[PDB]
Protein backbone atom coordinates (compact mmCIF):
# COMPACT_ATOMS: atom_id res chain seq x y z
CA UNK A 1 0.00 0.00 0.00
CA UNK A 2 3.07 2.27 -0.05
CA UNK A 3 2.55 4.79 -2.86
CA UNK A 4 4.93 4.38 -5.80
CA UNK A 5 7.02 1.66 -4.17
CA UNK A 6 5.89 -0.87 -6.76
CA UNK A 7 5.11 1.23 -9.85
CA UNK A 8 2.49 3.83 -10.82
CA UNK A 9 -1.10 3.00 -9.90
CA UNK A 10 -2.54 0.68 -7.31
CA UNK A 11 -0.15 -2.22 -6.88
CA UNK A 12 -1.69 -5.53 -7.84
CA UNK A 13 1.31 -7.87 -8.03
CA UNK A 14 4.95 -8.05 -9.11
CA UNK A 15 7.13 -10.64 -10.89
CA UNK A 16 10.94 -10.95 -10.67
CA UNK A 17 13.41 -11.71 -13.44
CA UNK A 18 17.16 -12.11 -13.15
CA UNK A 19 19.49 -9.85 -15.11
CA UNK A 20 23.32 -9.91 -15.25
CA UNK A 21 24.44 -8.54 -11.86
CA UNK A 22 20.92 -7.33 -11.19
CA UNK A 23 17.21 -7.88 -10.99
CA UNK A 24 14.21 -6.69 -13.00
CA UNK A 25 10.78 -6.25 -11.43
CA UNK A 26 7.66 -6.32 -13.58
CA UNK A 27 5.01 -4.46 -11.58
CA UNK A 28 1.34 -5.02 -12.44
CA UNK A 29 -0.85 -2.11 -11.34
CA UNK A 30 -4.45 -0.94 -11.73
CA UNK A 31 -5.00 2.46 -13.35
CA UNK A 32 -8.47 4.10 -13.34
CA UNK A 33 -9.82 5.37 -16.64
CA UNK A 34 -12.69 7.22 -18.35
CA UNK A 35 -14.12 9.29 -15.53
CA UNK A 36 -17.46 11.09 -15.45
CA UNK A 37 -18.42 14.04 -13.27
CA UNK A 38 -21.37 13.98 -10.88
CA UNK A 39 -23.03 16.05 -8.18
CA UNK A 40 -22.32 14.90 -4.65
CA UNK A 41 -23.31 15.48 -1.03
CA UNK A 42 -21.90 14.41 2.33
CA UNK A 43 -25.11 13.18 3.98
CA UNK A 44 -28.81 12.72 3.24
CA UNK A 45 -31.68 13.93 5.39
CA UNK A 46 -34.74 11.75 5.89
CA UNK A 47 -37.27 11.79 8.76
CA UNK A 48 -35.13 14.41 10.45
CA UNK A 49 -32.15 12.06 10.53
CA UNK A 50 -28.79 12.34 8.78
CA UNK A 51 -27.58 9.33 6.78
CA UNK A 52 -24.00 8.66 5.83
CA UNK A 53 -22.72 6.02 3.42
CA UNK A 54 -21.21 2.90 4.94
CA UNK A 55 -18.70 2.66 2.13
CA UNK A 56 -19.03 4.76 -0.99
CA UNK A 57 -20.19 8.23 -1.94
CA UNK A 58 -23.64 9.62 -2.65
CA UNK A 59 -23.79 10.79 -6.27
CA UNK A 60 -26.50 12.30 -8.45
CA UNK A 61 -26.98 11.63 -12.15
CA UNK A 62 -28.96 14.86 -12.53
CA UNK A 63 -32.26 13.89 -10.92
CA UNK A 64 -31.70 10.78 -8.77
CA UNK A 65 -29.36 9.87 -5.92
CA UNK A 66 -27.28 6.69 -5.59
CA UNK A 67 -24.45 5.22 -3.52
CA UNK A 68 -21.38 4.03 -5.36
CA UNK A 69 -18.01 2.64 -4.43
CA UNK A 70 -15.36 5.30 -4.67
CA UNK A 71 -13.07 3.86 -7.35
CA UNK A 72 -15.41 2.25 -9.89
CA UNK A 73 -18.79 3.67 -10.88
CA UNK A 74 -21.49 1.19 -9.86
CA UNK A 75 -24.64 2.94 -8.64
CA UNK A 76 -27.19 1.46 -6.26
CA UNK A 77 -30.30 2.75 -4.56
CA UNK A 78 -29.95 4.18 -1.06
CA UNK A 79 -31.33 1.82 1.58
CA UNK A 80 -30.90 1.29 5.31
CA UNK A 81 -28.28 -1.39 4.59
CA UNK A 82 -26.24 1.03 2.49
CA UNK A 83 -26.03 3.74 5.13
CA UNK A 84 -25.90 4.48 8.81
CA UNK A 85 -27.63 7.15 10.86
CA UNK A 86 -26.16 9.74 13.18
CA UNK A 87 -27.83 12.84 14.58
CA UNK A 88 -30.40 15.11 12.98
CA UNK A 89 -30.08 17.07 9.76
CA UNK A 90 -29.23 20.51 11.16
CA UNK A 91 -25.47 20.29 11.72
CA UNK A 92 -23.98 19.00 8.46
CA UNK A 93 -22.98 21.58 5.85
CA UNK A 94 -24.40 20.64 2.48
CA UNK A 95 -26.94 18.01 3.50
CA UNK A 96 -29.53 17.07 0.88
CA UNK A 97 -33.10 15.79 0.98
CA UNK A 98 -33.91 12.34 -0.37
CA UNK A 99 -35.71 9.15 0.58
CA UNK A 100 -33.90 6.22 2.20
CA UNK A 101 -35.57 2.93 1.39
CA UNK A 102 -36.36 0.27 3.98
CA UNK A 103 -36.79 -3.31 2.71
CA UNK A 104 -38.64 -4.79 5.65
CA UNK A 105 -41.85 -2.77 5.65
CA UNK A 106 -42.50 -3.19 1.90
CA UNK A 107 -41.92 -6.86 2.54
CA UNK A 108 -44.65 -6.65 5.19
CA UNK A 109 -47.04 -5.14 2.60
CA UNK B 110 -2.18 7.23 -9.28
CA UNK B 111 -3.52 8.45 -12.60
CA UNK B 112 -5.62 11.42 -13.62
CA UNK B 113 -6.63 14.05 -11.10
CA UNK B 114 -10.27 13.59 -10.10
CA UNK B 115 -11.90 16.45 -8.24
CA UNK B 116 -13.64 15.96 -4.89
CA UNK B 117 -14.74 18.62 -2.35
CA UNK B 118 -12.20 19.19 0.37
CA UNK B 119 -14.35 18.36 3.41
CA UNK B 120 -15.25 15.08 1.72
CA UNK B 121 -11.53 14.39 1.22
CA UNK B 122 -10.96 15.13 4.89
CA UNK B 123 -13.67 12.62 5.75
CA UNK B 124 -12.01 9.89 3.68
CA UNK B 125 -8.82 10.65 5.51
CA UNK B 126 -10.54 10.40 8.91
CA UNK B 127 -11.82 7.00 7.80
CA UNK B 128 -8.24 6.03 6.98
CA UNK B 129 -7.23 6.37 10.64
CA UNK B 130 -10.23 4.62 12.15
CA UNK B 131 -12.70 7.42 12.92
CA UNK B 132 -16.14 7.52 11.36
CA UNK B 133 -16.79 10.41 9.06
CA UNK B 134 -19.75 11.83 10.93
CA UNK B 135 -17.12 12.86 13.51
CA UNK B 136 -15.64 15.12 10.84
CA UNK B 137 -18.89 16.47 9.45
CA UNK B 138 -20.27 17.28 12.89
CA UNK B 139 -17.09 19.15 13.91
CA UNK B 140 -16.06 20.71 10.60
CA UNK B 141 -15.84 24.28 11.93
CA UNK B 142 -13.78 23.38 14.99
CA UNK B 143 -11.47 21.16 12.94
CA UNK B 144 -10.89 23.98 10.46
CA UNK B 145 -10.29 26.52 13.23
CA UNK B 146 -7.70 24.18 14.74
CA UNK B 147 -5.93 23.65 11.42
CA UNK B 148 -5.83 27.40 10.83
CA UNK B 149 -4.36 28.19 14.24
CA UNK B 150 -1.81 25.41 13.78
CA UNK B 151 -0.69 26.81 10.43
CA UNK B 152 -0.54 30.32 11.86
CA UNK B 153 1.75 29.09 14.62
CA UNK B 154 4.35 27.78 12.14
CA UNK B 155 5.07 31.12 10.52
CA UNK B 156 5.35 32.66 13.97
CA UNK B 157 8.07 30.21 14.93
CA UNK B 158 9.72 30.81 11.55
Ligand SMILES: *[C@@H]1O[C@H](CO)[C@@H](O[C@@H]2O[C@H](CO)[C@@H](O)[C@H](O)[C@H]2NC(C)=O)[C@H](O)[C@H]1NC(C)=O
Pocket residue numbers: 061062063064
Ligand atom coordinates in the same frame (compact mmCIF):
# COMPACT_ATOMS: atom_id res chain seq x y z
C1 LIG C 1 -30.83 8.88 -13.76
O1 LIG C 1 -31.00 7.50 -13.65
C2 LIG C 1 -32.36 7.10 -13.54
C3 LIG C 1 -32.34 5.60 -13.36
O2 LIG C 1 -32.82 5.22 -12.08
C4 LIG C 1 -33.17 7.54 -14.77
O3 LIG C 1 -34.54 7.53 -14.40
C5 LIG C 1 -35.52 6.58 -14.90
O4 LIG C 1 -36.03 5.99 -13.70
C6 LIG C 1 -37.11 5.08 -13.89
C7 LIG C 1 -37.55 4.64 -12.51
O5 LIG C 1 -36.53 4.88 -11.55
C8 LIG C 1 -36.67 3.92 -14.77
O6 LIG C 1 -37.79 3.08 -15.03
C9 LIG C 1 -36.11 4.45 -16.09
O7 LIG C 1 -35.60 3.38 -16.88
C10 LIG C 1 -35.01 5.48 -15.84
N1 LIG C 1 -34.52 6.01 -17.10
C11 LIG C 1 -35.29 6.58 -18.03
C12 LIG C 1 -34.59 7.05 -19.27
O8 LIG C 1 -36.51 6.72 -17.89
C13 LIG C 1 -32.89 8.98 -15.17
O9 LIG C 1 -33.33 9.21 -16.50
C14 LIG C 1 -31.41 9.35 -15.08
N2 LIG C 1 -31.26 10.78 -15.24
C15 LIG C 1 -30.35 11.34 -16.05
C16 LIG C 1 -30.36 12.84 -16.10
O10 LIG C 1 -29.56 10.68 -16.70
Ligand SMILES: *[C@@H]1O[C@H](CO)[C@@H](O[C@@H]2O[C@H](CO)[C@@H](O)[C@H](O)[C@H]2NC(C)=O)[C@H](O)[C@H]1NC(C)=O
Pocket residue numbers: 093094
Ligand atom coordinates in the same frame (compact mmCIF):
# COMPACT_ATOMS: atom_id res chain seq x y z
C1 LIG D 1 -20.93 26.17 -2.66
O1 LIG D 1 -20.63 27.50 -3.03
C2 LIG D 1 -21.76 28.21 -3.56
C3 LIG D 1 -21.26 29.57 -3.99
O2 LIG D 1 -20.56 29.50 -5.22
C4 LIG D 1 -22.88 28.29 -2.52
O3 LIG D 1 -24.02 28.87 -3.14
C5 LIG D 1 -24.52 29.98 -2.37
O4 LIG D 1 -25.36 29.53 -1.31
C6 LIG D 1 -25.83 30.60 -0.48
C7 LIG D 1 -26.54 29.97 0.70
O5 LIG D 1 -25.62 29.60 1.71
C8 LIG D 1 -26.71 31.53 -1.30
O6 LIG D 1 -27.17 32.59 -0.47
C9 LIG D 1 -25.91 32.08 -2.47
O7 LIG D 1 -26.74 32.87 -3.31
C10 LIG D 1 -25.30 30.94 -3.29
N1 LIG D 1 -24.46 31.47 -4.35
C11 LIG D 1 -24.44 30.98 -5.59
C12 LIG D 1 -23.51 31.65 -6.55
O8 LIG D 1 -25.15 30.03 -5.93
C13 LIG D 1 -23.22 26.90 -2.00
O9 LIG D 1 -24.14 26.99 -0.92
C14 LIG D 1 -21.96 26.18 -1.54
N2 LIG D 1 -22.25 24.83 -1.11
C15 LIG D 1 -22.10 24.43 0.15
C16 LIG D 1 -22.41 22.99 0.42
O10 LIG D 1 -21.73 25.19 1.04
Ligand SMILES: *[C@@H]1O[C@H](CO)[C@@H](O[C@@H]2O[C@H](CO)[C@@H](O)[C@H](O)[C@H]2NC(C)=O)[C@H](O)[C@H]1NC(C)=O
Pocket residue numbers: 045096097
Ligand atom coordinates in the same frame (compact mmCIF):
# COMPACT_ATOMS: atom_id res chain seq x y z
C1 LIG E 1 -35.34 19.41 3.20
O1 LIG E 1 -36.52 18.94 3.86
C2 LIG E 1 -36.74 19.57 5.12
C3 LIG E 1 -37.94 18.89 5.75
O2 LIG E 1 -39.13 19.63 5.55
C4 LIG E 1 -36.92 21.07 4.93
O3 LIG E 1 -37.10 21.70 6.19
C5 LIG E 1 -38.07 22.76 6.05
O4 LIG E 1 -37.41 23.95 5.63
C6 LIG E 1 -38.32 25.03 5.38
C7 LIG E 1 -37.50 26.17 4.82
O5 LIG E 1 -36.14 26.10 5.25
C8 LIG E 1 -39.03 25.40 6.68
O6 LIG E 1 -39.98 26.42 6.40
C9 LIG E 1 -39.74 24.19 7.26
O7 LIG E 1 -40.24 24.50 8.55
C10 LIG E 1 -38.79 23.00 7.37
N1 LIG E 1 -39.52 21.81 7.79
C11 LIG E 1 -39.22 21.11 8.88
C12 LIG E 1 -40.08 19.92 9.16
O8 LIG E 1 -38.29 21.43 9.62
C13 LIG E 1 -35.71 21.64 4.21
O9 LIG E 1 -35.88 23.02 3.92
C14 LIG E 1 -35.47 20.89 2.92
N2 LIG E 1 -34.28 21.39 2.24
C15 LIG E 1 -34.33 22.05 1.08
C16 LIG E 1 -33.01 22.49 0.52
O10 LIG E 1 -35.39 22.29 0.51
Ligand SMILES: *[C@@H]1O[C@H](CO)[C@@H](O[C@@H]2O[C@H](CO)[C@@H](O)[C@H](O)[C@H]2NC(C)=O)[C@H](O)[C@H]1NC(C)=O
Pocket residue numbers: 142145146
Ligand atom coordinates in the same frame (compact mmCIF):
# COMPACT_ATOMS: atom_id res chain seq x y z
C1 LIG F 1 -12.70 19.88 22.42
O1 LIG F 1 -11.58 20.71 22.53
C2 LIG F 1 -11.73 22.03 21.99
C3 LIG F 1 -10.40 22.71 22.18
O2 LIG F 1 -9.74 22.90 20.93
C4 LIG F 1 -12.88 22.76 22.67
O3 LIG F 1 -13.13 23.97 21.96
C5 LIG F 1 -12.75 25.15 22.69
O4 LIG F 1 -13.55 25.29 23.86
C6 LIG F 1 -13.23 26.44 24.65
C7 LIG F 1 -14.06 26.34 25.91
O5 LIG F 1 -13.23 26.29 27.06
C8 LIG F 1 -13.50 27.70 23.85
O6 LIG F 1 -13.17 28.84 24.62
C9 LIG F 1 -12.67 27.67 22.57
O7 LIG F 1 -12.98 28.80 21.77
C10 LIG F 1 -12.94 26.38 21.79
N1 LIG F 1 -12.08 26.31 20.62
C11 LIG F 1 -12.54 26.29 19.37
C12 LIG F 1 -11.50 26.21 18.29
O8 LIG F 1 -13.73 26.34 19.12
C13 LIG F 1 -14.15 21.90 22.63
O9 LIG F 1 -15.15 22.51 23.42
C14 LIG F 1 -13.87 20.51 23.17
N2 LIG F 1 -15.06 19.68 23.09
C15 LIG F 1 -15.52 18.99 24.14
C16 LIG F 1 -16.76 18.19 23.90
O10 LIG F 1 -14.97 19.01 25.22
Ligand SMILES: *[C@@H]1O[C@H](CO)[C@@H](O)[C@H](O)[C@H]1NC(C)=O
Pocket residue numbers: 035036037
Ligand atom coordinates in the same frame (compact mmCIF):
# COMPACT_ATOMS: atom_id res chain seq x y z
C1 LIG G 1 -16.36 17.70 -15.78
O1 LIG G 1 -16.85 19.04 -15.87
C2 LIG G 1 -15.83 20.03 -15.91
C3 LIG G 1 -16.46 21.42 -15.99
O2 LIG G 1 -17.19 21.67 -14.79
C4 LIG G 1 -14.95 19.81 -17.15
O3 LIG G 1 -13.88 20.76 -17.16
C5 LIG G 1 -14.36 18.39 -17.09
O4 LIG G 1 -13.59 18.15 -18.28
C6 LIG G 1 -15.50 17.38 -17.00
N1 LIG G 1 -14.95 16.03 -16.88
C7 LIG G 1 -15.68 14.96 -17.27
C8 LIG G 1 -15.11 13.57 -17.14
O5 LIG G 1 -16.79 15.12 -17.73
